[PDB]
JSON list of C-alpha atoms in Angstrom, two decimals:
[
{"chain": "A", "resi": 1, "resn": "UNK", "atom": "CA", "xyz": [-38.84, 32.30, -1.50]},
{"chain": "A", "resi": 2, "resn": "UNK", "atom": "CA", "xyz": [-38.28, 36.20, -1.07]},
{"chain": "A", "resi": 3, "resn": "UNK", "atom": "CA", "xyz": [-40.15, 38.96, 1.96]},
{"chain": "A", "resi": 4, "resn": "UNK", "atom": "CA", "xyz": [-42.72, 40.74, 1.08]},
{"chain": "A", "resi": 5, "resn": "UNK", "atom": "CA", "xyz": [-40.67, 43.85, 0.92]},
{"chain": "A", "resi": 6, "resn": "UNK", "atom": "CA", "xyz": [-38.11, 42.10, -1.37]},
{"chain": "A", "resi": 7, "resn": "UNK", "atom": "CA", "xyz": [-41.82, 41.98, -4.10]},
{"chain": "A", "resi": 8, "resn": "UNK", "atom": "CA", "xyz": [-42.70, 45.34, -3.54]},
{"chain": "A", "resi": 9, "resn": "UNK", "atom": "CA", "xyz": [-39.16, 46.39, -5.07]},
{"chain": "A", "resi": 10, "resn": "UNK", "atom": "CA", "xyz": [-39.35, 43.85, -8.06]},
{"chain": "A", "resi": 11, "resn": "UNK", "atom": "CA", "xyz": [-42.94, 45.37, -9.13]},
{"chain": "A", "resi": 12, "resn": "UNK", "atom": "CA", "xyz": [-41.65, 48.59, -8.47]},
{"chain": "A", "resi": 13, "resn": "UNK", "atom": "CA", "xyz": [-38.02, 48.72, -10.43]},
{"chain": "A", "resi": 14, "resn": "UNK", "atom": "CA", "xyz": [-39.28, 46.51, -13.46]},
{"chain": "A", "resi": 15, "resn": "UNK", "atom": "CA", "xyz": [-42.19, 48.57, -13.86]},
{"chain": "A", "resi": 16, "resn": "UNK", "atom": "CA", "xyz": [-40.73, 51.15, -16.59]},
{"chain": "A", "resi": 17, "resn": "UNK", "atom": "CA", "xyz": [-40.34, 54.90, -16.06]},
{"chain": "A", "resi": 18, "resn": "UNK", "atom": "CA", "xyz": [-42.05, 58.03, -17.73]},
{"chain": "A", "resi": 19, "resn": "UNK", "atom": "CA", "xyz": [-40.18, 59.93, -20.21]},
{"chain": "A", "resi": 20, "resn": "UNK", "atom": "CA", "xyz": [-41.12, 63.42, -21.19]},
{"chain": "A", "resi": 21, "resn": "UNK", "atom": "CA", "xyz": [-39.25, 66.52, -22.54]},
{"chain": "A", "resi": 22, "resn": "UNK", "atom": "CA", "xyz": [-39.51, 69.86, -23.21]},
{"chain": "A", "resi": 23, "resn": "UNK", "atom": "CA", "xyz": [-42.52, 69.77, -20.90]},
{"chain": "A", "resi": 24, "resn": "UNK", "atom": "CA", "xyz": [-43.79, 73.50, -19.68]},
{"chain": "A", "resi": 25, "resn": "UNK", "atom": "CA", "xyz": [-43.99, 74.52, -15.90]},
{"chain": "A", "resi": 26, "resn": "UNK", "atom": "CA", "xyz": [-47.77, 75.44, -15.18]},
{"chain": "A", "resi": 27, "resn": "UNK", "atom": "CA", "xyz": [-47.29, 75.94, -11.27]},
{"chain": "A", "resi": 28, "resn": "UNK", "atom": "CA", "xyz": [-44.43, 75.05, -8.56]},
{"chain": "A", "resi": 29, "resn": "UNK", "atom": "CA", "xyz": [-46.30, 75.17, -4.58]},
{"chain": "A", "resi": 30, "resn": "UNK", "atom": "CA", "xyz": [-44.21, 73.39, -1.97]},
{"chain": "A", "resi": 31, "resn": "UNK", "atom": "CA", "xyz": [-43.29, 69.78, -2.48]},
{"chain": "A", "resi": 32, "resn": "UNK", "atom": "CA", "xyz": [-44.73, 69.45, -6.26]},
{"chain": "A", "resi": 33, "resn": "UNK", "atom": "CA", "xyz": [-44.89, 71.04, -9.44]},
{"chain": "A", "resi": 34, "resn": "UNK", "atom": "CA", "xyz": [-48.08, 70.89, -12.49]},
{"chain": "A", "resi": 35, "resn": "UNK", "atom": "CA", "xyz": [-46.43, 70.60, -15.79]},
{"chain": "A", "resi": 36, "resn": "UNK", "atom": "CA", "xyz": [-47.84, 70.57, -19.03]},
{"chain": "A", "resi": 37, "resn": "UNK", "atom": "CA", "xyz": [-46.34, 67.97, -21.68]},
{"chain": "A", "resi": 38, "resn": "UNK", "atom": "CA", "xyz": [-45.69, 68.61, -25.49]},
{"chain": "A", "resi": 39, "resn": "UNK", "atom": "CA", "xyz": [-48.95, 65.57, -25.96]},
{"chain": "A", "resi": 40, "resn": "UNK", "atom": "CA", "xyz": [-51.15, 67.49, -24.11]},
{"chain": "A", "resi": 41, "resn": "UNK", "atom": "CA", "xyz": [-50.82, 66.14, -20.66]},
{"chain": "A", "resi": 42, "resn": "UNK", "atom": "CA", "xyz": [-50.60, 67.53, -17.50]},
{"chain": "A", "resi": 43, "resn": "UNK", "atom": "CA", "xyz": [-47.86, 65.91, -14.77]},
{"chain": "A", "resi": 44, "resn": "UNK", "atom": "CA", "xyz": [-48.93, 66.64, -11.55]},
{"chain": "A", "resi": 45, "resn": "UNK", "atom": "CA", "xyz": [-45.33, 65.27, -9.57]},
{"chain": "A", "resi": 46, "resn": "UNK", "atom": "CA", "xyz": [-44.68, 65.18, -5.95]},
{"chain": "A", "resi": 47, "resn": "UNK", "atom": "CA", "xyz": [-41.17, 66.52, -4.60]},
{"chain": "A", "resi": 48, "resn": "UNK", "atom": "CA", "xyz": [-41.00, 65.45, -0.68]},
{"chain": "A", "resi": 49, "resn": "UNK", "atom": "CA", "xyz": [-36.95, 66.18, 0.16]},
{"chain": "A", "resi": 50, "resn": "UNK", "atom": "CA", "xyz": [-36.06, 69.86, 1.48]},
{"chain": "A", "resi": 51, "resn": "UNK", "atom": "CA", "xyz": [-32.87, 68.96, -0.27]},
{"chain": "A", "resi": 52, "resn": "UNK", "atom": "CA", "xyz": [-34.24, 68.59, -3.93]},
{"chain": "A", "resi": 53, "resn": "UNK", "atom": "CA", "xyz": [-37.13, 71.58, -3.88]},
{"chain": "A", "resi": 54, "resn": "UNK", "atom": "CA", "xyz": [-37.08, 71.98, -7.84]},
{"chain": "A", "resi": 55, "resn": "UNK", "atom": "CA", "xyz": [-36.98, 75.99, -7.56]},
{"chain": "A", "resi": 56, "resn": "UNK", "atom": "CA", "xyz": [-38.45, 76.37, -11.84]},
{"chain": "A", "resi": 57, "resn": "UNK", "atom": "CA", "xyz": [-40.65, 78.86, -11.83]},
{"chain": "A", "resi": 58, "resn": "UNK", "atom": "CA", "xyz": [-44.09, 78.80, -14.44]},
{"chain": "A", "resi": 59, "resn": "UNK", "atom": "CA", "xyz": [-43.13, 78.89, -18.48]},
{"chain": "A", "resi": 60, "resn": "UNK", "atom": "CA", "xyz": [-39.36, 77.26, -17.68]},
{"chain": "A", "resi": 61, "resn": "UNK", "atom": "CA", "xyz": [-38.87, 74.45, -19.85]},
{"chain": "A", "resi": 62, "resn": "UNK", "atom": "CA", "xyz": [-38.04, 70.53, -18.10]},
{"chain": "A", "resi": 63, "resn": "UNK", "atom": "CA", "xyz": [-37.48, 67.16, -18.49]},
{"chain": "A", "resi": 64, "resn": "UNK", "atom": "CA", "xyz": [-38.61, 64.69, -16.90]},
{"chain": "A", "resi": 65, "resn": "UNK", "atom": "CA", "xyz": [-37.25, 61.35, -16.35]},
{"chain": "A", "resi": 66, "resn": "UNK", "atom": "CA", "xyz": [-39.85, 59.78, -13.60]},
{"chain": "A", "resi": 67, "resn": "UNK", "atom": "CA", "xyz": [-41.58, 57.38, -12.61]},
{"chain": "A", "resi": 68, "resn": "UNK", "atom": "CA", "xyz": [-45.38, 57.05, -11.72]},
{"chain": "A", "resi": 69, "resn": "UNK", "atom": "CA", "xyz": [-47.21, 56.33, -8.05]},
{"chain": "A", "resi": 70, "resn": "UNK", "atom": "CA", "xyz": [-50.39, 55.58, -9.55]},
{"chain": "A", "resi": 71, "resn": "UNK", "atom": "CA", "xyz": [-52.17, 55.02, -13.00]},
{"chain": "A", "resi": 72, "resn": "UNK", "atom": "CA", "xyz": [-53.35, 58.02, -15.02]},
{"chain": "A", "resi": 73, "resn": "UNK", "atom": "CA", "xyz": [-56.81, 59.46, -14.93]},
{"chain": "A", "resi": 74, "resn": "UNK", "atom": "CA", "xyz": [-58.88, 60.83, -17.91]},
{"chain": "A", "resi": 75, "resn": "UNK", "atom": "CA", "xyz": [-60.79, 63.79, -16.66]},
{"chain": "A", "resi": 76, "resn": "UNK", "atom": "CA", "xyz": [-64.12, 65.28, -16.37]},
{"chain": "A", "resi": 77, "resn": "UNK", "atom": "CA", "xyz": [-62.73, 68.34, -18.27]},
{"chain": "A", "resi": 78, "resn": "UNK", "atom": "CA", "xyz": [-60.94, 66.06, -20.79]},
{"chain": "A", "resi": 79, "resn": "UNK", "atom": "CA", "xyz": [-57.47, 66.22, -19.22]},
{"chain": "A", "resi": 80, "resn": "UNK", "atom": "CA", "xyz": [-55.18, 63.57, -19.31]},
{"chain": "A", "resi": 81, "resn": "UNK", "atom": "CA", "xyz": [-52.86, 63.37, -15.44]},
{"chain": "A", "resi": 82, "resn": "UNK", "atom": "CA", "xyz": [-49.84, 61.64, -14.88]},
{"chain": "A", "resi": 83, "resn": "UNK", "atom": "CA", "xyz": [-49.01, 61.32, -11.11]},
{"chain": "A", "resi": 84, "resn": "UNK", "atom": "CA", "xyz": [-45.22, 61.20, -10.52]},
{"chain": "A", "resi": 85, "resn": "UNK", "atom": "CA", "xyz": [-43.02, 61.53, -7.71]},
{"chain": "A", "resi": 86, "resn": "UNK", "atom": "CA", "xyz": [-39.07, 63.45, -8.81]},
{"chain": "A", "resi": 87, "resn": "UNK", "atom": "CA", "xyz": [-37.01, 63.28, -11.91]},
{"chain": "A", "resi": 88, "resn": "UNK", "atom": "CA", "xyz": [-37.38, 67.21, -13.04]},
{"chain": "A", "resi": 89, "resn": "UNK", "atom": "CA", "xyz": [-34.33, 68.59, -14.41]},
{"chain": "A", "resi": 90, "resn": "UNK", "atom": "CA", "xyz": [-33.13, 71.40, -16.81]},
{"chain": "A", "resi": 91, "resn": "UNK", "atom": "CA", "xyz": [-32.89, 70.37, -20.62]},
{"chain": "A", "resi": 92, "resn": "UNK", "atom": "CA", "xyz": [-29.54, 70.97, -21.29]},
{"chain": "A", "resi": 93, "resn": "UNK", "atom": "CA", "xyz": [-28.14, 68.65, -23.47]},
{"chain": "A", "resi": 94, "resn": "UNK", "atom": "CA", "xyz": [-24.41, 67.54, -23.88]},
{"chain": "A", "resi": 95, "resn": "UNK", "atom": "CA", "xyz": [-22.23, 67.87, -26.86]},
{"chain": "A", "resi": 96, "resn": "UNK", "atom": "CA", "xyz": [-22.00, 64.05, -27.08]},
{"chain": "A", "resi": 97, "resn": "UNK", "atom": "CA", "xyz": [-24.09, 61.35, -25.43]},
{"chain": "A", "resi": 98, "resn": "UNK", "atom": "CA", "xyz": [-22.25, 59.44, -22.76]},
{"chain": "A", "resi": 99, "resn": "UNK", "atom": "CA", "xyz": [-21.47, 55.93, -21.28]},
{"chain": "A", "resi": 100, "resn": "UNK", "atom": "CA", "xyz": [-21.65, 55.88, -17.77]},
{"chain": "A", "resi": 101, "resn": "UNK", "atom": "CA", "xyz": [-19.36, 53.55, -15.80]},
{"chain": "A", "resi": 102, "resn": "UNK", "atom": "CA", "xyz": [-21.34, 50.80, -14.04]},
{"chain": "A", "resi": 103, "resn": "UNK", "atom": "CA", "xyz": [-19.00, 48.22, -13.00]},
{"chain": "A", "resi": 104, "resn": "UNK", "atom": "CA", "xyz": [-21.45, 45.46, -11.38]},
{"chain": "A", "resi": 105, "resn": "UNK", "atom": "CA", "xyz": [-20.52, 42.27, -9.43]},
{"chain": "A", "resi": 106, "resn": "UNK", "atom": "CA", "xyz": [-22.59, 39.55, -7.75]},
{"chain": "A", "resi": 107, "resn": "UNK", "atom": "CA", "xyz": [-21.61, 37.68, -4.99]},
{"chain": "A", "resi": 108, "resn": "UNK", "atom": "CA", "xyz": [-17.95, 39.38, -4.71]},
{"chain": "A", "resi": 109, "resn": "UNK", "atom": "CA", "xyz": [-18.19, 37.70, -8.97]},
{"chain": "A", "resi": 110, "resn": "UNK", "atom": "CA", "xyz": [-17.62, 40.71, -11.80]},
{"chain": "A", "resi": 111, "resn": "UNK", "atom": "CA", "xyz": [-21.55, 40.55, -14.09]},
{"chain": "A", "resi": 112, "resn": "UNK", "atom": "CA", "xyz": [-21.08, 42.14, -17.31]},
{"chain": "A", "resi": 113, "resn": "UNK", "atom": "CA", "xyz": [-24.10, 44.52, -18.28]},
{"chain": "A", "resi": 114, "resn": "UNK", "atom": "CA", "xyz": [-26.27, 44.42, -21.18]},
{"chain": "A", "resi": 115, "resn": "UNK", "atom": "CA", "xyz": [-28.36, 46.81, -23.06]},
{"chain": "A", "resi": 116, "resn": "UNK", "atom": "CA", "xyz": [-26.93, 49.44, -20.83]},
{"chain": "A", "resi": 117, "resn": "UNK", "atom": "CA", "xyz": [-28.04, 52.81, -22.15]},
{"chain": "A", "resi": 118, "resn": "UNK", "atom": "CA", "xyz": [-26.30, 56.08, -23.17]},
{"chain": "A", "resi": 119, "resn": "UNK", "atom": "CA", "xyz": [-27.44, 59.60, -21.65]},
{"chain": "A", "resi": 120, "resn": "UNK", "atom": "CA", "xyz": [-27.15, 62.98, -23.45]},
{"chain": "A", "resi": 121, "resn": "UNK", "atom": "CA", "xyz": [-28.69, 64.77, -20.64]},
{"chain": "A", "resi": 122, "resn": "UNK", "atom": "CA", "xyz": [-26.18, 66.86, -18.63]},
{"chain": "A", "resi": 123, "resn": "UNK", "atom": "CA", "xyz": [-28.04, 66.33, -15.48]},
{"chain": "A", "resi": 124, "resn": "UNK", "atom": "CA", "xyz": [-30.31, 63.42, -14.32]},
{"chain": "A", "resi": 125, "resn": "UNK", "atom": "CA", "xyz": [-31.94, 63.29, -10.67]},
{"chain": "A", "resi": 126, "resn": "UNK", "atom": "CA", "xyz": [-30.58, 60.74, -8.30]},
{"chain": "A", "resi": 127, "resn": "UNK", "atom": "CA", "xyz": [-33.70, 58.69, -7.91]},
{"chain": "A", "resi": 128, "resn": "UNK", "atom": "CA", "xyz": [-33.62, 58.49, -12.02]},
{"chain": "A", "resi": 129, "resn": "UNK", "atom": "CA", "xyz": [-30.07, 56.88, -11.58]},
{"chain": "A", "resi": 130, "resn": "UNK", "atom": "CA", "xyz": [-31.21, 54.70, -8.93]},
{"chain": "A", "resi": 131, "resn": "UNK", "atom": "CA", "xyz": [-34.04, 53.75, -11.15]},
{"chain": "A", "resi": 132, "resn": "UNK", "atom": "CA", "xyz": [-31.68, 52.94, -13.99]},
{"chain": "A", "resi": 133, "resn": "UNK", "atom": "CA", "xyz": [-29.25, 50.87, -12.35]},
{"chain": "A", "resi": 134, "resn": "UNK", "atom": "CA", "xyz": [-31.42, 49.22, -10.25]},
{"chain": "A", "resi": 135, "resn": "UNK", "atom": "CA", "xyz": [-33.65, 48.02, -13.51]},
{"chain": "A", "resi": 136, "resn": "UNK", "atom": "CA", "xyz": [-30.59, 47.19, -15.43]},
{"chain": "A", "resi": 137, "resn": "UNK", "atom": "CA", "xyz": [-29.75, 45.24, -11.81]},
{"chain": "A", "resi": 138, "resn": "UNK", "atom": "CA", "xyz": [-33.26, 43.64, -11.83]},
{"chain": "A", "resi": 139, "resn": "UNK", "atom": "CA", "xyz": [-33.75, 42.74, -15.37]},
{"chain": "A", "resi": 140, "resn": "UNK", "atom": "CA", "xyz": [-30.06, 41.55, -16.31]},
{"chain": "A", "resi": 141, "resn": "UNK", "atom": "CA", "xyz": [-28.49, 40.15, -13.21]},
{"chain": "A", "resi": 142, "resn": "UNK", "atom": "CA", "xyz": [-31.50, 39.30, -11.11]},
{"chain": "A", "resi": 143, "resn": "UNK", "atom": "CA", "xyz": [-32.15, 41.02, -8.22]},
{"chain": "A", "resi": 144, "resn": "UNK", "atom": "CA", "xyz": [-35.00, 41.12, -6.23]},
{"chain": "A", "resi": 145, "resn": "UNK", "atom": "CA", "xyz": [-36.25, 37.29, -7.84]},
{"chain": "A", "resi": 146, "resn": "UNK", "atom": "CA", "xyz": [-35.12, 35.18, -5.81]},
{"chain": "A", "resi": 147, "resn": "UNK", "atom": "CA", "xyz": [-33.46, 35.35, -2.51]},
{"chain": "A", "resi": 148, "resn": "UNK", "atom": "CA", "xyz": [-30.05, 34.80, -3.11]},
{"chain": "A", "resi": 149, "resn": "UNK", "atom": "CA", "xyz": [-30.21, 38.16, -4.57]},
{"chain": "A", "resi": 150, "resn": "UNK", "atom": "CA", "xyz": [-32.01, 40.58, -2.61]},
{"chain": "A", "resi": 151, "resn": "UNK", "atom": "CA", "xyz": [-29.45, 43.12, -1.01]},
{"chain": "A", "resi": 152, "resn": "UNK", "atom": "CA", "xyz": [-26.11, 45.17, -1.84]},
{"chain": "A", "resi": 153, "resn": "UNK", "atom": "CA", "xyz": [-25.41, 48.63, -2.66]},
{"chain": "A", "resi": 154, "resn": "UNK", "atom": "CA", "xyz": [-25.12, 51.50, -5.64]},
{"chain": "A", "resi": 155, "resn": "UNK", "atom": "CA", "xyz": [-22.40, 53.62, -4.75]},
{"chain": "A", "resi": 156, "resn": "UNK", "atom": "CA", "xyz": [-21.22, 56.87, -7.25]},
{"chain": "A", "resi": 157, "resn": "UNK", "atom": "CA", "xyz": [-17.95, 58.33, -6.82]},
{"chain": "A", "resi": 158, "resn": "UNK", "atom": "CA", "xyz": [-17.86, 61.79, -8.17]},
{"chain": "A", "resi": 159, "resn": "UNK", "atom": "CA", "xyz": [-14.56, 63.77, -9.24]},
{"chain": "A", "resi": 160, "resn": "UNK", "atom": "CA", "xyz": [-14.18, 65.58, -6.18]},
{"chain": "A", "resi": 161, "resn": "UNK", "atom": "CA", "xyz": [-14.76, 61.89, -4.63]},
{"chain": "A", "resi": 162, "resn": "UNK", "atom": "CA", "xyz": [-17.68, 62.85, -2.80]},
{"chain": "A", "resi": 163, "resn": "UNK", "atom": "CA", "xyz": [-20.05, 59.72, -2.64]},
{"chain": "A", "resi": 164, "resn": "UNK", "atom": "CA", "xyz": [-23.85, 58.72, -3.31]},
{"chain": "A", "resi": 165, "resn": "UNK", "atom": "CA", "xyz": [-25.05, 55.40, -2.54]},
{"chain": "A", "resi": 166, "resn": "UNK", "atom": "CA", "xyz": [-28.09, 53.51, -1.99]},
{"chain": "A", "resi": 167, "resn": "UNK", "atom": "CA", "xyz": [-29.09, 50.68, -0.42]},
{"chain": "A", "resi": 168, "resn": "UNK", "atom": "CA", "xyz": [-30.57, 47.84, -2.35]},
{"chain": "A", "resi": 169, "resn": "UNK", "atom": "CA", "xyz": [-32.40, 45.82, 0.18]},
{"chain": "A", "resi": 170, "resn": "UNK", "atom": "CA", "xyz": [-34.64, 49.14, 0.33]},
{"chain": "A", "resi": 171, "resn": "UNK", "atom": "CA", "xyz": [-36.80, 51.41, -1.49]},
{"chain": "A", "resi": 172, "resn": "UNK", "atom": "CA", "xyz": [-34.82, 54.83, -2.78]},
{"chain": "A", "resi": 173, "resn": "UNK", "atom": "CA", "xyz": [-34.97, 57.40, -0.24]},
{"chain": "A", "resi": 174, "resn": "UNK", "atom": "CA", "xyz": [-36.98, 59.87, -1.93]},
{"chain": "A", "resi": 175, "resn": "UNK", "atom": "CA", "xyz": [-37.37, 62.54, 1.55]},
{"chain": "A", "resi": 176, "resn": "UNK", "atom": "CA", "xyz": [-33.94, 63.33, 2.03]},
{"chain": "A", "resi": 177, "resn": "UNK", "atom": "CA", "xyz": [-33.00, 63.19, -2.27]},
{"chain": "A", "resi": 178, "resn": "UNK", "atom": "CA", "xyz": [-29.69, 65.29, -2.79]},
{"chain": "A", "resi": 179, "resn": "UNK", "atom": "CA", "xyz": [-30.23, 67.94, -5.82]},
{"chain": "A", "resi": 180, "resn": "UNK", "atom": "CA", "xyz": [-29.58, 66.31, -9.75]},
{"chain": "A", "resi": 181, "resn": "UNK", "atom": "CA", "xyz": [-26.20, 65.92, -10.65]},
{"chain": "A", "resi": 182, "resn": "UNK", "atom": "CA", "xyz": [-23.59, 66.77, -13.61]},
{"chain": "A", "resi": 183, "resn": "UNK", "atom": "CA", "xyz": [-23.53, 63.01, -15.23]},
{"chain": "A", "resi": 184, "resn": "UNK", "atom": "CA", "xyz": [-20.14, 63.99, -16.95]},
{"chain": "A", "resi": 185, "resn": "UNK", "atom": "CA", "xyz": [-18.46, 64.59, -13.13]},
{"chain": "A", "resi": 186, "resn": "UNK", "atom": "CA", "xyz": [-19.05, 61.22, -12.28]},
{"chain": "A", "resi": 187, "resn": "UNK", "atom": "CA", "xyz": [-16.03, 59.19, -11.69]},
{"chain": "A", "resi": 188, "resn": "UNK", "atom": "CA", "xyz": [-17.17, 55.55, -11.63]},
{"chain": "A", "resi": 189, "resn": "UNK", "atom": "CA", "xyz": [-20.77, 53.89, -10.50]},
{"chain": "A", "resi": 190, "resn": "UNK", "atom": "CA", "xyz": [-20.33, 50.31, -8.45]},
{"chain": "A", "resi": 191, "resn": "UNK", "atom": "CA", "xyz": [-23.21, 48.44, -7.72]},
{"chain": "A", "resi": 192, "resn": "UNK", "atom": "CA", "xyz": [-22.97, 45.10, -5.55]},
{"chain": "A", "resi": 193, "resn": "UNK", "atom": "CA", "xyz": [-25.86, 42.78, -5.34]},
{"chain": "A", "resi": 194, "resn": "UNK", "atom": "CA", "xyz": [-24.69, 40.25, -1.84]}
]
């Protein structure tokens, strides 16, 4: 049997993740942004670190790569509203998608990945690469279903060898979020499930 907390972060990283680009600022106030998408709908997305204050200003151009608090509502005036929380970046593309380098291991054992994806973004939000390991974590190599596998840690090593991690046994720390990173400056990605 797992905690209660242990659930709340197997609904939340196997739910999937909202993928829109080429979406259109409307309005950027403190701590969110309104964006209109290329179907029509409006993202209204909350931003709650002082480190990751998405500075785009209205008619800029994003991408978003996020996830949703809360289902969608239709509208009185016919509007269709996402409600997300991060995962706004520029849509700069590189020349060539990319493999990132996720070496994984569970219980001290090496876990080869599957179905692993390849990004052609040049920069992706931290919380969307905690989302994406942390699925390919949950629906590959089991964690969070049963409670042999409920803790461990992300860690990204960039050139410069300045580190990101995250803790597994937790939910990703979206109020103190660093700023989106280059994908192509990362040196490796480890992820540990205990």
């Amino acid at each position: 049997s797992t905690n209660d907390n242990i659930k709340d972060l197997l609904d939340w990283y196997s739910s999937g993740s909202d993928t829109f680009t080429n979406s259109e600022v409307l309005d950027n106030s403190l701590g969110s942004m309104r964006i209109k998408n290329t179907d029509g709908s409006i993202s209204l997305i909350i931003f709650p670190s002082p480190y990751y204050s998405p500075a785009f200003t209205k008619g800029e151009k994003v991408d978003l790569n996020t996830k949703r608090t809360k289902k969608s509502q239709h509208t009185s005036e016919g509007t269709y509203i996402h409600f997300q929380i991060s995962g706004v970046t520029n849509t700069e593309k590189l020349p060539t998608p990319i493999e990132l380098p996720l070496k994984v291991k569970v219980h001290g054992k090496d876990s080869p990945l599957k179905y692993w994806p390849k990004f052609d973004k040049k920069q992706l939000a931290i919380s969307t690469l905690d989302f994406e390991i942390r699925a390919q974590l949950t629906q590959i190599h089991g964690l969070y279903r049963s409670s042999d596998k409920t803790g461990g840690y992300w860690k990204i090593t960039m050139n410069d060898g300045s580190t990101y991690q995250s803790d597994l046994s937790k939910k990703f720390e979206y109020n103190t979020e660093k700023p989106p990173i280059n994908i192509d400056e990362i040196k490796t990605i480890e992820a540990e499930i205990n």
